[PDB]
Amino acid sequence: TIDTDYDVIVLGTGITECILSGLLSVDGKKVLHIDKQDHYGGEAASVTLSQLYEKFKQNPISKEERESKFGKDRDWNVDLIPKFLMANGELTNILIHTDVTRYVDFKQVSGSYVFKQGKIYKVPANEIEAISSPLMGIFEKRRMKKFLEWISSYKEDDLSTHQGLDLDKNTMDEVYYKFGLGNSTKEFIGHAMALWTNDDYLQQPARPSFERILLYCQSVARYGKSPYLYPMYGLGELPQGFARLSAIYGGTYMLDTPIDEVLYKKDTGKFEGVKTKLGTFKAPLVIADPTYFPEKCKSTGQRVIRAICILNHPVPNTSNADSLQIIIPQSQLGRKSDIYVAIVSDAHNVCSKGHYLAIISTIIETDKPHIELEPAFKLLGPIEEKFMGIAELFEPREDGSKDNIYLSRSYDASSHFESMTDDVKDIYFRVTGHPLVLKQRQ
Amino acid sequence: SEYDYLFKLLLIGNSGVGKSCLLLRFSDDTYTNDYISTIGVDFKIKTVELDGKTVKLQIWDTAGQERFRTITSSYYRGSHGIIIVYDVTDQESFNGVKMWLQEIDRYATSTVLKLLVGNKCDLKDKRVVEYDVAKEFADANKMPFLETSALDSTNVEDAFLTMARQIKESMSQQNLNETTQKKEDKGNVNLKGQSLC
Ligand SMILES: Nc1nc2c(ncn2[C@@H]2O[C@H](COP(=O)(O)OP(=O)(O)O)[C@@H](O)[C@H]2O)c(=O)[nH]1
Numbered sequence A: 001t002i003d004t005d006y007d008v009i010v011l012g013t014g015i016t017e018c019i020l021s022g023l024l025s026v027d028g029k030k031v032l033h034i035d036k037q038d039h040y041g042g043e044a045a046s047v048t049l050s051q052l053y054e055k056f057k058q059n060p061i062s063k064e065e066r067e068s069k070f071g072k073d074r075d076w077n078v079d080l081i082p083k084f085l086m087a088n089g090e091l092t093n094i095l096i097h098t099d100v101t102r103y104v105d106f107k108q109v110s111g112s113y114v115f116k117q118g119k120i121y122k123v124p125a126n127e128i129e130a131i132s133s134p135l136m137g138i139f140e141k142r143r144m145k146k147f148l149e150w151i152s153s154y155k156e157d158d159l160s161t162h163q164g165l166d167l168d169k170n171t172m173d174e175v176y177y178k179f180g181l182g183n184s185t186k187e188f189i190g191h192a193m194a195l196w197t198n199d200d201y202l203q204q205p206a207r208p209s210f211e212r213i214l215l216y217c218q219s220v221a222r223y224g225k226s227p228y229l230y231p232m233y234g235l236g237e238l239p240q241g242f243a244r245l246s247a248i249y250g251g252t253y254m255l256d257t258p259i260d261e262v263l264y265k266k267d268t269g270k271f272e273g274v275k276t277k278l279g280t281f282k283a284p285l286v287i288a289d290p291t292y293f294p295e296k297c298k299s300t301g302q303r304v305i306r307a308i309c310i311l312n313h314p315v316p317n318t319s320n321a322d323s324l325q326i327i328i329p330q331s332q333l334g335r336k337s338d339i340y341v342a343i344v345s346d347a348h349n350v351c352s353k354g355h356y357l358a359i360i361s362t363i364i365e366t367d368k369p370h371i372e373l374e375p376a377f378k379l380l381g382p383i384e385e386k387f388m389g390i391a392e393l394f395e396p397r398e399d400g401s402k403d404n405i406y407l408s409r410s411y412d413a414s415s416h417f418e419s420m421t422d423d424v425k426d427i428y429f430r431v432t433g434h435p436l437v438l439k440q441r442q
Numbered sequence B: 001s002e003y004d005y006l007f008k009l010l011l012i013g014n015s016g017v018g019k020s021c022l023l024l025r026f027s028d029d030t031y032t033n034d035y036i037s038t039i040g041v042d043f044k045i046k047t048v049e050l051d052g053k054t055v056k057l058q059i060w061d062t063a064g065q066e067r068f069r070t071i072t073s074s075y076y077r078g079s080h081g082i083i084i085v086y087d088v089t090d091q092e093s094f095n096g097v098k099m100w101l102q103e104i105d106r107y108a109t110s111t112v113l114k115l116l117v118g119n120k121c122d123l124k125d126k127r128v129v130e131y132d133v134a135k136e137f138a139d140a141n142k143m144p145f146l147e148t149s150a151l152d153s154t155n156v157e158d159a160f161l162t163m164a165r166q167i168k169e170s171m172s173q174q175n176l177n178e179t180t181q182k183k184e185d186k187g188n189v190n191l192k193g194q195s196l197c
């Protein structure tokens, strides 16, 4: 009694696939969404503490020992892949248009800190903090102020606001030169505001950097304190909310359902459907994460180490903040990639009272990945427990137009979700042939 | 407008037992024969007067996620009461209640209130789950029991009012205070509010 025909079959319930499922169902498409796993979230799921031990430890501890040290398993929602939301980012725009805010609550992240020579400093979130910050000297702050005034008064359609600069012809380094900004200021803007993980952007057209810096400023302006929001109960609430949106608009969901076989149109290599323990389902195209079609994906060459740490106290030198980001610019450690730390606690309902979660991550560049994180571990003070893992980043070999197999990218090392929504918009364009246009749900 | 307490209620149970029709009968006073909706019910808000107090209820429905049992932690967040529904003409739907109780034990708070509802009681000729058997099971699982009919309205309003009373009378003073209008703001942000560049 299960329909065999659908407009779209989606495999894996990571957030990229769940947003696409919700949007396609809202568009009126008949969607079948299947996951071989017994829970939502895919690689960016939030898991309980017992699940964290099963996944990262050799000999998981007993329930009695776990509860005496950490409390009830239900108080824990631990992200496997850390991500914050820019307050004015595209995911917030999708959340408001789809009303998925009905299924997920958000709280501000207290602040973002940048590392400089062994110490961390809170990045300003208002003018009083900007005046107080020792990150820049008095004369350099005056130049920085002119640069920020240009970021806000710039209007694409009005050449008189460009101050002689062209975002497509000029490189970001040329933009810095026009404002006379020194190297330390370039590092702060590039790594703390644009959030680039290295300095390659200096020799590239300024446009993408300008957009990222403006996004940061607009995000801080939304609620103050920092440019980020974080969901109550963890990132896993997001794929679950979009899966509910898809279900409301007609989507059909199956979990714990392996794909016995992918079916292809005779001699064409084009997707036709899937065979499962519940039957065979057909659709002209499939949307899926790399774990369903490893042969159709390739490594980007990057491996990311993620160290999930549990603390029984606030992070040192953060004024007892309930949540924060720490950015360690690669220039401060002679590295090729920045190291990030994402910190949340019971204020966001991700762990029991008194504990903090600090997830450290970076792109691996040495033979001893654990040692690359030592500068970040040192910022946390005593660590109760560490759950370490290394993930390789994959991307599709092709865009799916030739085989109707539209694949998402592995979740990357960036500290927030803008690159994930870029993947959602790109996949949507590949699947439908036109750009995503959000409609306000009634 | 103003209310004394705001509660979050959920409906749960096997596909086809009448959860969506029960909610529509309580919220809109309507019933559609052979109900089929392209867009599923999300939730309904209803304010009732309960023993002198104004109680606002946000009642959630499953959006069909129970078809292949794909409802997880998100649906149960912040829930105060859960109404478990079965169909008195479907033995398997009653057997399914044991599994739903295990899901509630896993995802909801240990203090969540529960109510058992045997729906479609208008189908007198096709009843297979006897009232006494269901009542004994409800007593064994610490929950009140009512047989309802979204079709003819039997006990529908009373099932939701019974759950609202269960919550209001069972909550600790601290938990009840958290549902008052004065404590509605939990410190979360409103993504649609005006900016504070
Ligand atoms: N006879 C009868 N049919 C009912 C009753 N409630 C719901 N139904 C029918 O049973 C089917 C499933 O109802 P639905 O509300 O979609 O239940 P759900 O799948 O649990 O949400 C529809 O054909 C309804 O019209 C009831 O009280 N009596």
Ligand SMILES: *C/C=C(\C)CC/C=C(\C)CC/C=C(\C)CCC=C(C)C
Binding pocket: A123, A124, A125, A126, A127, A129, A130, A131, A133, A135, A136, A141, A142, A144, A145, A148, A193, A217, A218, A220, A221, B197
């Ligand atoms: C719209 C953005 C606001 C209100 C704040 C965010 C500004 C940041 C992150 C820049 C920091 C600038 C410094 C430290 C330089 C001094 C600049 C002034 C005192 C305007």
Ligand SMILES: [Mg+2]
Binding pocket: B019, B020, B021, B061, B062, B063, B064
């Ligand atoms: Mg229903």
